Amino acid sequence: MDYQIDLVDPLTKVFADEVPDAWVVATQMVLQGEPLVLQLAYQRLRDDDASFSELTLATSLSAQCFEINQVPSQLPTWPHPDARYLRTTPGLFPDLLTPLTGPVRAYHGQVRALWLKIPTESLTPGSYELTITLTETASGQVVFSQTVPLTVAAAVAQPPRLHHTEWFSVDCLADYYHEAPYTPRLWAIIGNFMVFAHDEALMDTLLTPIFTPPLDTAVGATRTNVQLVQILPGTPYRFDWSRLRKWCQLAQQSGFAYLEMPPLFTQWGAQATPTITDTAGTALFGWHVPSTAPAYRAFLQALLPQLLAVLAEEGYDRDHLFFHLADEPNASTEDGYRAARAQVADLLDGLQVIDALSDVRFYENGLVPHPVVADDALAPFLAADAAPLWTYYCCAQTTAVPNRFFALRSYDNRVLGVLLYRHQIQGFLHWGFNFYNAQLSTRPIDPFAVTDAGGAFPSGDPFLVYPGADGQPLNSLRNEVQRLGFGDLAVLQQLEALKGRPFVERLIDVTAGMVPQFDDYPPDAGWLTRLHEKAVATLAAAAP
Amino acid sequence: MDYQIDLVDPLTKVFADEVPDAWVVATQMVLQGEPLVLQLAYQRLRDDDASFSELTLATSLSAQCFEINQVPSQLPTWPHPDARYLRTTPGLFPDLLTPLTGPVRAYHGQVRALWLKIPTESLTPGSYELTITLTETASGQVVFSQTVPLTVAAAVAQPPRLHHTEWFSVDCLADYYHEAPYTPRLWAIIGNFMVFAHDEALMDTLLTPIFTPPLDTAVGATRTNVQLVQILPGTPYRFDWSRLRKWCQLAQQSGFAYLEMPPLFTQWGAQATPTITDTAGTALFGWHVPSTAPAYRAFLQALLPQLLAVLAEEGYDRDHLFFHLADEPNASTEDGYRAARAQVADLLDGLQVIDALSDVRFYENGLVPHPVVADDALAPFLAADAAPLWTYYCCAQTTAVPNRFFALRSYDNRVLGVLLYRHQIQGFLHWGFNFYNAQLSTRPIDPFAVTDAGGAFPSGDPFLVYPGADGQPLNSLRNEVQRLGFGDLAVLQQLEALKGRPFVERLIDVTAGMVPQFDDYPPDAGWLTRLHEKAVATLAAAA
Amino acid sequence: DYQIDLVDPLTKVFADEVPDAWVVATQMVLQGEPLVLQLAYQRLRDDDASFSELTLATSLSAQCFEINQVPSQLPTWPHPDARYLRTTPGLFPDLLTPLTGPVRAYHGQVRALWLKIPTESLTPGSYELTITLTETASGQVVFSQTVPLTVAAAVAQPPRLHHTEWFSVDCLADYYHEAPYTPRLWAIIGNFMVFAHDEALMDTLLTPIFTPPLDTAVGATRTNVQLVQILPGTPYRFDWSRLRKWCQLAQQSGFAYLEMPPLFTQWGAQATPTITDTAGTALFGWHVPSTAPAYRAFLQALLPQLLAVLAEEGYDRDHLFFHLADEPNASTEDGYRAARAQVADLLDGLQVIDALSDVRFYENGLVPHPVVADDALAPFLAADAAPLWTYYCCAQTTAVPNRFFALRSYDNRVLGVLLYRHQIQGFLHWGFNFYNAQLSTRPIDPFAVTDAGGAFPSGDPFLVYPGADGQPLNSLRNEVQRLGFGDLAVLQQLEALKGRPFVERLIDVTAGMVPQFDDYPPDAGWLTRLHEKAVATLAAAAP
């Protein structure tokens, strides 16, 4: 009666001021390598003179444990929020994950939660009993004990097949951690952020600042310079490659199979050029030099043969590279995109060139052969059978479709996985791995205090990871939930290897009661848990 | 149509969550020098496709204007909150003030507020007409206009008389801005904070780190070293005053009349000494050297004559200095205070030594002749007619008494001023000007994200000011409200100059309906406004 | 032009203040349970008319009331705690009047409506309730709001609890100018009896067998309301016609229990009730001691005969409550013994109840069935006393539930969950309709004087007001207590489904603590959540 401690659904968001639903315990089954994921909520009902009481966690198998931290939001939603959104007004939302490194503090008058992962690659197949205990460190009384049966199947977890890039901001690390591009300490921090990106965020593709990306910048303004290709004073062009080389050695070592090149013109119109300097610091391109400048055709004609040469030397052939022209064109800016392409189409021969888009006309016009499409605009590109096809979401995908905002359900994030599968999407892109700026980079923000880009974007949009004091990225609930969805993709793919694709499509549709669509998926979240278990049971029932 | 915009009482806290009540415009009267202070709440009612619509602010007279910023709290109260507390669970609280440097953004679905002050120091006496307007930047249409009459008496606002110290942490600036003690950029930042403290927090007294203060430190741990007195290696003690000369020059140029020295012994038990090193970096004193160490007694017999001489050269004589023995002894540590006392008492003859208590018993013993007394513990000291008397408040003053927590009313902050007056308290001390650490300084915290010392202290306790990115302090609502309380104390002091004390005491009591006490003051704030008005009208009429 | 908003049912809307809005959320009710909303309104447009007229419509049948501002000159007793909303003489929202025409929206003042949507006749499902206000000059719509409503298939069961609010016939006599007992007085008594059972949720009625010895100055006489009449002369003959009348209206109005008045005088039990014969000659009263052998002989005659008449009216020994005298302390204890000893043998077999705040006198067996003040329950709960009742009155000013105009509506409704949590079998209040000054020195006008002539906090003495047509008018204090009772009912309905432990567990978890009578959560939202959870669980188990 002194404590209220309970396991909860991993898709619940635990708010400090409401008691959540208990998970009813049932036997679990995981492929060997697949972790078991639980969430545990807790408060101290005893009304004594101390604000909290210390508790000791124990597990009968090795686990990895996080505290879930409440973080502020001043703009949880954009206008006209639909009925999926949990809350709507400025408040606190759960998101940040800090490692558990001592006793847990159970507070009176408010609820808190832990994130628990039980790794399984060391476990010989068979049946287990997982006991979780909390002990009042002051008295040695055991206040919580819960046993969860865990079967580890003979079948090994395969990883998912999908291209995944979450845009990377080197300037945001420079500014936050107070380090000139590119000190040794900055290189160490970038390293840490890259290992997280590959291993924990399940990225195979990485944005590489060949020059400072012409992205999220105010007309006329300037992000901290992060160009990896450096250029000596002088008009016959001579390149210094040392930073690119070091960059690629760290990506390779961090596990990246692909690098993604920044856009060659400016966002939303392709009107100007990226802010490029020489080694003295003298601007050569920028907002004052239009896209159609002859000087910039000449700059690139020189650069592109040599740059591919350097990238191949570092283990990235033309089949392991993605290029961009300009980001997020629509009908208004059709002819800007056209005009800029015309300056450069003949230089990008045989390269894979992609761009993020909503308007199918750009694909039929052939301006954009390889489109990344908004997840509320997919239907016209499915009609036309475009392959390959990628998807993305951002501030603007507010209605009916998947997204990761603080004020939405975790289910709206996780449900991406099955939907990538069901509709044969090959890639997923997102602009905000680590954007710690106000809209249009007018100034830096503190990501622990501001999650809404300075009151411009719904919270949860601009960054997936927080910058730890030690230079190490801190995990988020949004990322751990995105992982569950990627683990859904991967078991469905593994199931398709054993049976039809037809078989898996029938099984998704029957478990949903419908063909799940990106803008129309079931209102209840329980069907995902049931698809995932069925998939896992069919692969186990069939293993040697 | 379209917007919803109203003036609100200065003592209202506007949540992003709720519409507050409108101030009914009355004529204001100010003595000359005294600012008019207003608050303005705002919201866009039109449900378009933009989240917000920019507005422009104009005033008839020069205003300093601030946007009021919502800040997170994970621990709004300690156990068993009384019913004065506004909210009692984790959420956002209005506290941080940022200069308004452009248009204001009126959002749909959420309320926001500005703090406005109209200086009066340059208006010649008379009747003015303060008009406040907001214009929609898109449509050039005016969507808010209110006019507040303002009278400026020929009578001049005199400043409050009272010792006030709010403990300063150099280690917290060093760590937040990532500057080693003591670089040129750290000196400039310290200066910025020192000028806010005097002019904007109304302090006359500054905590001066002769050595790193033995405060809020876990047994056996260490904060960044900020000691102003440097010791050269070797046993006939040679000292380097350079850091301390610089400190005192910035202190004096910022207007501080008094400096406060840190405790000579460790907090609570008084068991050990402060962490002092030499120029090579070698530990001379600390947790591993007891208070009763002959060496430490020797060190202070060398240090105290030489430091007094140097402070006097910086223009702080023995009657402008406060000294500390050990913070916060209680019944069970009483002997440790005695033992430490008896090592150094002979070296402190003719110095003003003070320490902070809740137990009256250390006063009854003569152990602490000059007590700083918790504001929920005053009654036995008032009765034992102790004088001089200072008071303080911290985490541990949760019930029935003045404090500044995010979750208490602004009233509970502002009332402090009349109560100092009424009960003849001579000083006010607070431990948290700018503590940007977790409890016991086990690590630094982000003061914009964490306001409760890592979930140990009710939010609004550990710091008064925030660290701006330019290196300048950012103001708080808590400070602005407490400045109103000092404004109350000032006019009542000025009124007692004209009539006696009995006259003023009598006006307080009749206006309140009762003799107001620290643990028993009227339920509604209105009476503070009426007494402020009464005392101003009377003073103006005498000019 | 207008400013119109749904507000929380627990909000008190003052004329001089805009209250916070209710964010619409899907409402779930059991079938039979009503949806209750409050609606605040004002005109912003500043024309030359003081008000403009509006028409209300609702897509479902609604029962609607205007909330009326009523005066108080004594809002609190001394030393009020911080829960008290206002504490000086003003106007307070309380009286409820049927809405018979259009709403008048005024400039410079806020007003409110109380809205109830019955549900007994909706078949289960999802509904959309639309609420609209339409300016009548201009035929346009100035407010529209849809609130979603699910009516479960699971049926709302009534609360289990004994509840009496003491009834004063003399106050109906005096106010409507009717001598006991005329045809028109009987009809007005019935109107009040019907409200009592059906609208105030009483199962028990105080029956004036003789004029109740309550609220009477020593040596005085309230109007004679005795239903039992006594022919003149010493071999005692009784006339039952007024009793039979009383009992029939009581039974037709739905009362299962009748409550007999105290046998001895208040505060000491020194003397006897003011009893006359039919000539008018006084047989008992202030002039006859309680030890008088005549009073015992009067009751040995009366009691067997009254029990027989009451059983004819359908009220047996298990459906009657008897009183002796209230509040034995160290003073009165000696004469309460004296008096008790004079009659105890006649009362064996009968349920005898009395007010008691000292547990010694329960243990003693001096008072077997105690009605305990809600600020004194701890020692009785410590002794597992059972059955146990509670009351509150002028004297329960601090930390505990009450009804006062100046308290939060929260502090009234919260009683429901606390009665459940602590297994309290019954609730008694003294003031159903006391329209007199203290000690019954004179009648008062209940629309103009709400504090018994400046004696008791306003909201204490009566729950209903007297309508011009001789029908009771409702009050907000009554509507809010009906919420509290609705909470108790769902919690009891849920205990039939799970057990008590499960329901205690949900109470404590939702509250974040074990709620006590003198220590319940700071904020009221936890009640709304608790009520929602209970209802969702009962709906889910229906087949």
mmCIF file with all atom_site columns, C-alpha atoms in Angstrom, chain C residues 224 226-233 237-242 275-283:
data_model
loop_
_atom_site.group_PDB
_atom_site.id
_atom_site.type_symbol
_atom_site.label_atom_id
_atom_site.label_alt_id
_atom_site.label_comp_id
_atom_site.label_asym_id
_atom_site.label_entity_id
_atom_site.label_seq_id
_atom_site.pdbx_PDB_ins_code
_atom_site.Cartn_x
_atom_site.Cartn_y
_atom_site.Cartn_z
_atom_site.occupancy
_atom_site.B_iso_or_equiv
_atom_site.pdbx_formal_charge
_atom_site.auth_seq_id
_atom_site.auth_comp_id
_atom_site.auth_asym_id
_atom_site.auth_atom_id
_atom_site.pdbx_PDB_model_num
ATOM 1  C CA . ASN C 1 224 ? -45.473 25.676 18.580 1.00 0.00 ? 224 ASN C CA 1
ATOM 2  C CA . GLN C 1 226 ? -46.259 19.961 17.966 1.00 0.00 ? 226 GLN C CA 1
ATOM 3  C CA . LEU C 1 227 ? -48.003 17.244 15.889 1.00 0.00 ? 227 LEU C CA 1
ATOM 4  C CA . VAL C 1 228 ? -48.910 15.295 19.027 1.00 0.00 ? 228 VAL C CA 1
ATOM 5  C CA . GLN C 1 229 ? -51.711 17.039 20.862 1.00 0.00 ? 229 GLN C CA 1
ATOM 6  C CA . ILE C 1 230 ? -52.599 16.537 24.463 1.00 0.00 ? 230 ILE C CA 1
ATOM 7  C CA . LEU C 1 231 ? -56.193 17.096 25.806 1.00 0.00 ? 231 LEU C CA 1
ATOM 8  C CA . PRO C 1 232 ? -56.098 19.094 29.123 1.00 0.00 ? 232 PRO C CA 1
ATOM 9  C CA . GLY C 1 233 ? -55.868 17.118 32.391 1.00 0.00 ? 233 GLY C CA 1
ATOM 10 C CA . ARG C 1 237 ? -55.081 11.547 26.349 1.00 0.00 ? 237 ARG C CA 1
ATOM 11 C CA . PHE C 1 238 ? -53.496 12.105 22.905 1.00 0.00 ? 238 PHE C CA 1
ATOM 12 C CA . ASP C 1 239 ? -54.589 13.429 19.542 1.00 0.00 ? 239 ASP C CA 1
ATOM 13 C CA . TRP C 1 240 ? -52.764 12.000 16.518 1.00 0.00 ? 240 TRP C CA 1
ATOM 14 C CA . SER C 1 241 ? -54.431 13.762 13.589 1.00 0.00 ? 241 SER C CA 1
ATOM 15 C CA . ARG C 1 242 ? -51.487 16.111 12.723 1.00 0.00 ? 242 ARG C CA 1
ATOM 16 C CA . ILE C 1 275 ? -44.960 21.107 25.296 1.00 0.00 ? 275 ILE C CA 1
ATOM 17 C CA . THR C 1 276 ? -48.505 22.474 25.652 1.00 0.00 ? 276 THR C CA 1
ATOM 18 C CA . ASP C 1 277 ? -51.996 20.908 25.825 1.00 0.00 ? 277 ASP C CA 1
ATOM 19 C CA . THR C 1 278 ? -54.887 21.996 23.546 1.00 0.00 ? 278 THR C CA 1
ATOM 20 C CA . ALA C 1 279 ? -55.968 24.794 25.958 1.00 0.00 ? 279 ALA C CA 1
ATOM 21 C CA . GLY C 1 280 ? -52.494 26.269 25.456 1.00 0.00 ? 280 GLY C CA 1
ATOM 22 C CA . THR C 1 281 ? -51.299 25.436 29.003 1.00 0.00 ? 281 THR C CA 1
ATOM 23 C CA . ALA C 1 282 ? -47.581 24.556 29.053 1.00 0.00 ? 282 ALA C CA 1
ATOM 24 C CA . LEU C 1 283 ? -46.870 21.039 30.525 1.00 0.00 ? 283 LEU C CA 1
#
